[PDB]
Each structure stands twice: as structure tokens, then as C-alpha cells.
Ligand binder design. Structure first.
Ligand SMILES: CC(=O)N[C@H]1[C@H](O[C@H]2[C@@H](O)[C@H](O)[C@@H](CO)O[C@@H]2O)O[C@H](CO)[C@@H](O)[C@@H]1O
Ligand SMILES: CC(=O)N[C@H]1[C@H](O[C@H]2[C@@H](O)[C@H](O)[C@@H](CO)O[C@@H]2O)O[C@H](CO)[C@@H](O)[C@@H]1O
Ligand SMILES: CC(=O)N[C@H]1[C@H](O[C@H]2[C@@H](O)[C@H](O)[C@@H](CO)O[C@@H]2O)O[C@H](CO)[C@@H](O)[C@@H]1O
Ligand SMILES: CC(=O)N[C@H]1[C@H](O[C@H]2[C@@H](O)[C@H](O)[C@@H](CO)O[C@@H]2O)O[C@H](CO)[C@@H](O)[C@@H]1O
Ligand SMILES: *[C@@H]1O[C@H](CO)[C@@H](O)[C@H](O)[C@H]1NC(C)=O
Ligand SMILES: *[C@@H]1O[C@H](CO)[C@@H](O)[C@H](O)[C@H]1NC(C)=O
Ligand SMILES: *[C@@H]1O[C@H](CO)[C@@H](O)[C@H](O)[C@H]1NC(C)=O
Ligand SMILES: *[C@@H]1O[C@H](CO)[C@@H](O)[C@H](O)[C@H]1NC(C)=O
Ligand SMILES: [Ca+2]
Ligand SMILES: [Ca+2]
Ligand SMILES: [Ca+2]
Ligand SMILES: [Ca+2]
Ligand SMILES: [Mn+2]
Ligand SMILES: [Mn+2]
Ligand SMILES: [Mn+2]
Ligand SMILES: [Mn+2]
Lengths: 238, 243, 243, 238
């Protein structure tokens, strides 16, 4: 009986917390990583954006854990004669969280080891194979306190096509499910694993996105969020 | 303009149209196919169950088509020294529709040929390979006027495990998406394809389920619905719905 | 456990149970009482309209009672050199209920005496003073098994102005609240009282409307429903509902 | 198609902006004005509390105006041998708004004249007659840029009884409606007037409450919010 819900088809900076390169465009697109005046994404970009209100994920008195779901449309595009990098992620982080390392660490980590004090749960849409931890194919991944996903599924990434994502968390089964569909291509992908939010996250978090572009010439992308809905519910006992 | 929503964690016959073998158990479960007096599914069973109010899927005056979503939990169980058959489906059908042939035709069809006047959109959960039309592995299928799915994905069926399904239809993209998760196994499956509702279905439909048991000894299953939510809008927020 | 919600900005007969004179106009309006071929309401008319699916209001196993809310826009208009009669009501009634006596009994009652087997909870919008039971001024009333309201408030009725109604029932406090606003006049009215649903209504009900025209020359009105939303929950967020 | 919704049966300070004397108690009650360790409210108190995310009320490009609704339960109680003062209000204010004068000005105004730059829309629950502007009976009032309500209705205030309020705004009719019911007493009250949000408010606002206690001995109250739900919807055009 704590409940929060929002849904935006267009964005504005007034109710968002924007970090580093993240901007809202004059078309109300949330552009997580830098794009120049020619409309070309640039290298070594990092941006993160969050809803301005913190969200209660669990409660240390009752032991209750929230159920949540989020949907969003994103557009990742690539200039001709480049390949994509590095990707974007929906995230749950500590209130006051600041950006970490760029590139393949997605602004979320400092290295590729597990860190039980990272307090990070993310669903990544990873467009670049990082030899020290990634599966080879592009992938949707569930990340808990590491850039090395606890679970992944192959994602047949296609540049410039709008991708519609749904992520759900059921606190009774502890199941986190992420799916992506490309409506114009009629293709769909799904990954699922259990996550113990209560052991990983603080009681309150900020929710939103992080994204990076490649550090090396020829590996680059736009990372645009086009719409976002979020809902959470945390039982209080009446 | 029009919105409809319902959600049941337990079922009752009062607001449901039950057909053939479909019963509401005394524990509030929707048993679509017959279980005997001991707790065993029986062969050749067919049952269909629908919400008692018709849903408007599209409008010929405005041309608008509904978006909808549905979620349900189901339990398919199989007796020992037996295999599963034949599966269950969520369906959209014309008002007043009657059960068709049982078995692998799921109470929805007379034959395995394409029938352009069947007016059927269904998402099937197929537990038995029918050599004449099915893919070999167990599958989730999107059925449009035919038992031969327009698209399927592999489903790693496991007996007696609760399965959670989400089906969504986006009228702006004409995309129908169906996913199933087994929460205790942490496995997940998704299939997607476009369906033009306006040329397949009448303007008003009934929504619900159909299921069958196998007709041949050793091929049988329970087809139980444990909970069901539906929403439609005709002129969806999926984060809100899934919650 | 159980939740039901619907919202219509335009009506269609397909999902409605229409009774006596109640028609859906070709412009999607729910005309509860008869209008002639020219656009004039006629005397002695009675019409009732219900959502086609039964709603569960309470459960005898658990003891739980539903909370619900409903909102609707209505237009009561009156011809020149005439006064209004007899009004319209939102009702909860047993499944299969038939119209009762017309006129000031609103199609809900046979007489003006308390009937403990009428199984009726209604919110009336009363346009005609019935000397034997009504307060003198026009009123909103909460009717429980009787046409003599358990509670009323003064309603400054104005002909042909759209009226927006909100009715809520909180099962935890047993409180039923009804309010009406005239947006173009900026006037508002509210009445509240407790109703014990569990001892008045069956476990399953039909929700909808009833209306009547006056039986005596010069007392007549249109009773039109322009839009309708309903929600119930059986184990409400009113900020969400009203929006 | 911008939509925001929240509903809390218990409060926590983490997602609220609290000003001056406002606190959240260990029972998760939002206590807008000061209460001492004996549970007695004190004089000359002022507190305000807001949801931490700003809410978009209108849009200067499309001219669209939001529809909203809010419900809340409040408890105003009075020690024996005092009378109540001064009351509480649900408010829509500029982002960054700071408290104004205490007592009968409810933390919202500096005097009792109209001020077209106050950017204030409030629904007041006024428990003390202020001779220079109030109607004599206690009242629910609609306030637009003045402590002198544009419209009022008599409120039969009863100390210590939970009051359930619903406030709705329809941007198509511009009608603001406020109602209060006391469920244990079965009584109910309603006020309605039109308000042009676009001429009064900035495009984005903070939503929440303000309350004060009397400045003069014998005029005092608790001003506790017990639950709160809010929803708004602003058309974007798809
Ligand atoms: C080792 C590796 O993964 N190299 C790829 C490189 O990755 C960058 C940086 O993004 C990574 O976070 C760190 C991991 O320590 O390594 C490098 O510094 O990104 C390139 C594209 O920009 C790839 O071509 C390399 O394969
Ligand atoms: C040909 C075939 O599919 N045989 C399988 C059989 O199918 C039944 C029935 O279920 C089908 O609907 C019709 C299709 O015309 O054929 C048969 O009568 O079901 C058996 C289990 O019940 C399978 O083992 C057969 O392979
Ligand atoms: C006695 C009375 O109420 N007379 C009014 C009359 O009422 C009709 C009918 O509407 C009532 O239901 C029954 C109650 O027994 O009495 C009459 O038959 O309606 C007239 C307008 O139609 C009023 O002017 C009478 O005052
Ligand atoms: C003049 C008046 O209203 N006096 C009442 C007094 O009001 C305070 C303060 O609360 C008001 O905002 C200002 C208006 O200029 O006047 C006074 O300073 O509050 C008393 C209770 O504390 C009442 O008894 C007075 O009637
Ligand atoms: C966001 O809103 C404010 C108006 O409050 C405006 O100043 C700003 O330019 C807006 N940005 C966009 C992209 O709409
Ligand atoms: C269905 O509802 C009726 C009450 O109207 C009741 O007799 C029956 O027990 C209900 N079924 C279940 C499974 O609860
Ligand atoms: C009711 O629905 C049917 C389509 O099934 C249509 O023929 C009729 O025009 C509809 N009524 C209105 C008022 O639109
Ligand atoms: C609010 O939440 C935080 C836990 O994140 C806690 O420190 C604080 O004491 C809480 N207050 C109440 C009243 O629950
Ligand atoms: Ca990578
Ligand atoms: Ca088959
Ligand atoms: Ca009357
Ligand atoms: Ca005052
Ligand atoms: Mn990866
Ligand atoms: Mn099949
Ligand atoms: Mn009456
Ligand atoms: Mn006042």
C-alpha cells in the first residue's frame, strides 16, 4: 500500500536528475549520451538519468519487498562505417549515486569484479562484446553488483529500430524478467533470473538509466529513450 | 473512449460462461478439462470458459482497433506413466461461439486447414506434437483462423509447475506478443508476430480459454487456470498492467 | 482478489442488458426513458440498463465486502410548459431483476413501504416531490429497500445541464457517498450515510440505471446517460478513479 | 500522456520535501505542525510537506492543462480547554517555494490582499475565523493567490475525527471540486469553483500540504496527514 506510478511519452528535465552527458532534446527525447550538432554520436560519452523522487524498494521493519515493472522505448542508432558501443541499462541505485567508469562498464562499475557494496541492480542492453566478461553475441543481461551478468540472452540488435522493453520484478517469487521486442521487425527476446533485492539494494533507491558510447574510433551509438513508464507497489500491511 | 479491466485470483461461475467440461472447483480454480472423482485427468475432455461480458475489439464507424493485455497463471499436470496432451489456449471469438473438435484441434477447429471464416485469434500452449501441422518440440503458438500457428517458439514444458503468461496486443503496431515464465525454474519464453484483428475478428468478441486432453491412452493432462487478469482500451500502459 | 473496472464515453447495447424503454441512441447515448419521433420525452415511460456481467459485492465464505466507485454524466431535460418527473437512479440489484412500478417508484418498488426482500441499494436523483414520502425540494437520496430515502440532500436541479456524479462505497467504514456537480453552473451537492451491503444485497449483483417519466400531463423529462465508469474491489484509490 | 500517480498509507521523509516544523513520526504519520513529547501541539507552529518530484500542471507549447485528483485522510485534534487554530491546506506551488507567514495566513501569504504573483492554488480546511477575511463558520475554501477564498462552504469541524478529503480538477471544465467526509459521523461537505491554472501557476509545481497552529494561547491543534494519494494526467498529443 505504498504505490508509485509514472508514464511519459515525452521528457522534460524538470522532474529528472541528469548526470554527465545526459540531456533532454527539444523534441522531448531523453538522450543519455552525447550527440553533436550534426546529429552524430561522439566517443567516450557517459550519461545517466533518474526520476527525481526516490522509490522504496523494501522495508527493514516489515521485511516487505516491492514488486515493480517498467516499460520503455529506446532507439540506438549507429553511423555508417561504425559499429555500435557500448549500450544502455535500466538501473536501481542508491539515492545520491554518482557515475562510475565509462565504456563497457556502462557508468556503473570501476572494474569487472563482483563488488557486494556496489548496491546495483540493472538490466543491460549490451551492444559490444567485452572479451574479459561478455558473451560474444549482443545480449540482454541481468546485472547484480557486477558488469558480468548473472544471466544473459542473445539480442539480435538492429540499429535505428525502436525497441520496446518490459522489465518486471515479482517480490513473492523474486523473479526479475526482462523482454525486448522490435515491433517493425516482429522479433522478441526474454531473460529471467531471481534477484534478492533486500540483500543487494538499500531500502530506497533512484530508478532510471545509464548509457555509454565506445572509447575507440569506429565503436559508437546514440542511446535515446523515447518513452518510459514505471510502477512499484510495496505492501505496508494496511 | 472504452476501457475494460478485470482481475481474478479465484474464480466463480456467476460471471463466466462455461462450456462442455469446464468447471470451477470448490477451491476457486478454473479446471478447463475434466478431472475424475480421484484427482486424475480423463481422455477426450474439452472445456471452454469465457468472461460473461462481450469486449469490443474494433469499431467500423471510426476504424479504431483495441489494444489489450491479458495475464494468467496456469498449471498443467500429468499422471505418471503418461505424457501430456493436448494443451490450452487463450482466445478471442465471436459472441455465442460453440466448442469445435477436441484433441489437437483445441476445441477451436474442425480440421487443420486454414478457415477464413473461423474468426479466431488464439495463443496456444501446445503440449502434443501433431505430425500434420505442429513443430516437433512443445511450443507456444499464435493461431489466426488455423490450428497451424502463424508463428511459434519452443516451450520447455515442465509438468505441475505454475506458469505465468503475459499476452499483449498493440493496435498501433498490430503486434501480438506472448510470453511465459516458470518462476520456480526461472525459465522464460517469448513469441511475437503481427495480427490484423480488423479483418479476422467481429467487432465484439468474447475472451477466455479453451483446453483439451489427449484422445489416446497415455496422453492426458490437467488444464487449470489459477488466476486471470484482462484489460482493453479502444479509442496500454504495460508497467501498470503487469503489476 | 477480485477487481472489475469499465469506462464508457459512448454506449452500445452489446454489453448492456436493456429493459423496458431503455435504448442506446445512434449517437451512443443511453436514453433510459422513451423519446418520441420528434425529440420529446413521453409520459409513463420506464427503462432500466445494466452492465451485462454480474459483480460480486460480498463473499459468505470470507465475510469480505466489496468497495466500489462509480461515476457518470447525465442530462435531464424538460420540454417547455412542463416540469420534470420522475428522476433516475444508479442501482445495485440481484441478477435477473425485472422492472417494478413506474412513476415515482422509479421502476424499483411496488409501493412506498419498506420492503426487506427488495434487495435494493440505490442512489436516486429525484425530480418530483411525492407528497407521501419525499422531502419537498428536489433531492439526491440514498435508497435502501425503500423509495423513502434513508438520507437525502437538497439538489438544485437545472434542466438540460450536464450533471457529473460520483458515488463511492467504502466497505471498511460501510459509508456510501454520492455527489453531483454541474460544471457549467459550478454548483455541487453531497449526501452520505452508512449502508450494510451484506444484509441487504445478494452476493452477486447487477449494476446500472433506472429512470421514469411522470404519469401526469406536464410532468416529463429525458433521462440520458452520456458516460459511465465503474470500479469494484473485493479482497479504492479515489484519486486514481476520479481521473 | 504525461501521467503521475502515488498513494501512501504511511509516510517516510525520504520522498518528501519537509519545511519548517513538518515531521514524519515513528508511526509514519505526516505531522505538519509541532507536537511536543507529551503529544500536545504547540503555538505559532508552521510546517509544509511536498512530494519530492515536481508535477507538470500545464504546457506553454500545446496550451494543454493537466487534470488531477488527490485524496487524503487528516486528523486535527485539540487539547481540552483550547479551541482549534489555524488549519491545513492542500497546495500547488512553484518549485522551490519557501514558507510565508504563520497563523491565519497558513504559511502561504504575507498579508490578506490579492497577489497575482503568489502563484498559489490551495484548498484550505480553516478552523479559525479571521475577522478581516473569513466567513464566521469553519469552512472548506478554494484559495487562488489570496487567503481570502474565492469560494467557501461551511465545515462542521469535529476535533479528533479522521476526515477523508477528495479534491479533483477537470481541465476541460476548469472546475476544481473539494469534498470532505467524516466516516464515523457520516457527515459530508462539498465546494466547487472554476480556476484557470494556466493564468495562476507556473508550468511545473510542487504538490503537498501546509499547516499552522494559533499564535494566541487557547487556539491550537495537531495537523496530521494520515494517508495521501495523488494522480495527474497531462495530454501531450500522442
Ligand atoms: C578489453 C576490452 O574489452 N576492450 C574493448 C574496449 O573496452 C574498453 C573499455 O570500454 C572497457 O570497459 C575496458 C575493460 O577494462 O577495456 C577497454 O579499455 O572497447 C573497444 C571499443 O571501444 C573494443 O573494441 C575492445 O574490444
Ligand atoms: C495425426 C495426429 O495428429 N495424431 C496424433 C493424435 O491426434 C488426434 C487428434 O488429437 C487430432 O486432432 C487429429 C487431427 O486430425 O488426429 C488424431 O485423431 O493424438 C495422439 C494423442 O492423443 C497422438 O499421439 C497422435 O500422434
Ligand atoms: C401521491 C403522489 O405522489 N402523487 C404524484 C404522482 O405520483 C404518481 C406516481 O408517480 C406515484 O408513484 C404514485 C405513488 O403511489 O402516485 C401517483 O400515481 O405523480 C404526479 C406527476 O406524475 C404528481 O404531480 C403527483 O403529486
Ligand atoms: C485579526 C485576527 O484575525 N486575529 C486573530 C489572530 O490572527 C493573528 C494571525 O493568525 C493572523 O494571520 C493575523 C492577520 O493579520 O492577525 C493576528 O496576528 O489569531 C487569533 C488566534 O491565534 C484569533 O483569536 C484572532 O481573532
Ligand atoms: C522543460 O520545461 C520547462 C518549462 O517549465 C522549459 O523551460 C524547458 O525548456 C522544457 N524543455 C523541453 C525540452 O521541453
Ligand atoms: C460461487 O458463488 C456462489 C455465491 O453466489 C457460491 O455459492 C459458490 O460457493 C461460489 N463458488 C466458489 C468456488 O466460491
Ligand atoms: C453497436 O455495435 C454494433 C457493432 O457490433 C453496431 O452495429 C452499432 O452501430 C453499435 N451502436 C452504436 C450506437 O454505435
Ligand atoms: C524512513 O526510511 C529510512 C530508511 O530508509 C529510515 O532511516 C527512517 O528512520 C524512516 N522513517 C520512518 C518514520 O519510517
Ligand atoms: Ca559489453
Ligand atoms: Ca498440438
Ligand atoms: Ca420523487
Ligand atoms: Ca482562518
Ligand atoms: Mn554484457
Ligand atoms: Mn501447435
Ligand atoms: Mn425521493
Ligand atoms: Mn478561510
Amino acid at each position: 500500500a505504498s504505490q508509485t506510478s509514472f508514464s511519459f511519452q515525452r521528457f522534460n528535465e524538470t522532474n529528472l536528475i541528469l548526470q554527465r552527458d545526459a540531456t533532454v532534446s527539444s523534441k522531448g527525447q531523453l538522450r543519455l549520451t552525447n550527440v553533436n550538432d550534426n546529429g552524430e554520436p561522439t566517443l567516450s560519452s557517459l550519461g545517466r538519468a533518474f526520476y527525481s523522487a526516490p522509490i522504496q524498494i523494501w522495508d527493514n521493519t516489515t521485511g516487505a519487498v516491492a514488486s515493480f515493472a517498467t516499460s520503455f522505448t529506446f532507439n540506438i542508432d549507429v553511423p555508417n562505417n561504425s559499429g555500435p558501443a557500448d549500450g544502455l541499462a535500466f538501473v536501481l541505485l542508491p539515492v545520491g549515486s554518482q557515475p562510475k567508469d565509462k565504456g563497457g562498464l556502462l557508468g556503473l562499475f570501476n572494474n569487472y569484479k563482483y563488488d557486494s557494496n556496489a548496491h546495483t541492480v540493472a538490466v543491460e542492453f549490451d551492444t559490444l562484446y567485452n572479451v574479459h566478461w561478455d558473451p560474444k553475441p549482443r545480449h540482454i543481461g541481468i546485472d547484480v553488483n557486477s558488469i558480468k551478468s548473472i544471466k544473459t540472452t542473445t539480442w539480435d540488435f538492429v540499429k535505428g529500430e525502436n525497441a520496446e522493453v518490459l522489465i518486471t520484478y515479482d517480490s513473492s517469487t523474486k523473479l526479475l524478467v526482462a523482454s525486448l521486442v522490435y515491433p517493425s521487425l516482429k522479433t522478441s527476446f526474454i531473460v529471467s533470473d531471481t534477484v534478492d533485492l533486500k540483500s543487494v539494494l538499500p531500502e530506497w533507491v533512484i530508478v532510471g538509466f545509464t548509457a555509454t558510447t565506445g572509447i575507440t574510433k569506429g565503436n559508437v551509438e546514440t542511446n535515446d529513450i523515447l518513452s518510459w513508464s514505471f510502477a512499484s507497489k510495496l505492501s505496508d500491511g494496511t
